[PDB]
């Protein structure tokens, strides 16, 4: 996260860390949506151009963290995966369209003051909150600058951008399964997600029922916090039917 601040303890109790076993390393961010399901970006697991294709056995999910490198004994929980489901039409070849994946944990995790799931939006919440100008929040342990890694979880609040503006900021083809967010060069405010943050949540707080909903998943961007550019996120609600399906089918 570039131009973000340290998060508070228990601020994003649904933030997850996809950790690699060997080498032991931070791979991506993810979110806790139930006591057994984690949501992340498919490119965090499968990306043939760079030969990435991870399996259950290569990943570990660390929930309840704050500090990036320390094993927060008695506070965080580490779970193994039982299954990984990538969206059947994830498009890694052209623009990372449908960059979403679900991971089933081996065992249910118990909630605590540091571990709690986020809600997934329903048609009406998507409709009322995904409006240009409204701010969302992104969190992660990713890089602090494009080219510098943090000790604690970072947070940044960013506005959603009109789709015309997003399309005219890149040569990549934007689909209806993505949205972009960030300030304009003309807003004297900065911020963006950066490498290491992919897979984490873009959330909004409903002013109707005070709950936090996960509207997007950090997907891609061209550099970090570059002026004229924005970060793109997978549109969770447009892929919700795929989510419900694997969850009530598995």
């Amino acid at each position: 996260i570039v131009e973000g601040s340290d998060a508070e303890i228990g601020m994003s109790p649904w933030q997850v860390m996809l950790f690699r076993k060997s080498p032991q390393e931070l791979l991506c961010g993810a979110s806790l949506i139930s006591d057994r399901w984690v949501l992340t970006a498919a490119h965090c697991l499968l990306y043939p151009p760079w030969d990435k294709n991870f399996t259950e056995n290569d990943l570990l999910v660390r929930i309840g963290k704050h500090s990036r490198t320390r094993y927060e004994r008695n506070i965080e929980k580490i779970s193994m995966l039982e299954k990984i489901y990538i969206h059947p039409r994830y498009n890694w070849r052209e623009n990372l369209d449908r960059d979403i994946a679900l991971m089933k944990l081996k065992k249910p995790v118990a909630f605590s003051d540091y571990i709690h799931p986020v809600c997934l939006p329903d048609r009406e919440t998507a409709a009322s909150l995904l409006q240009a100008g409204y701010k969302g929040r992104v969190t992660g342990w990713g890089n602090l600058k494009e080219t510098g890694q943090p000790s604690v979880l970072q947070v940044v609040n960013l506005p959603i951008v009109e789709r015309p503006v997003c399309k005219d900021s890149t040569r990549i083809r934007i689909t209806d399964n993505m949205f972009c967010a960030g300030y304009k060069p003309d807003e004297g405010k900065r911020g963006d997600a950066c490498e290491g943050d992919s897979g984490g949540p873009f959330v909004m707080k409903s002013p109707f029922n005070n709950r936090w909903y996960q509207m997007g998943i950090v997907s891609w961007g061209e550099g970090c916090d570059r002026d004229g550019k924005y970060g793109f996120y997978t549109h969770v609600f447009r892929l919700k039917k795929w989510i419900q399906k694997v969850i009530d089918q598995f």
Partner: peptide, 11 residues
């Protein structure tokens, strides 16, 4: 850079 985590999570 990352501190070691308990062996039971590797297995």
């Amino acid at each position: 850079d990352f501190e070691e985590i308990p062996e039971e999570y590797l297995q």
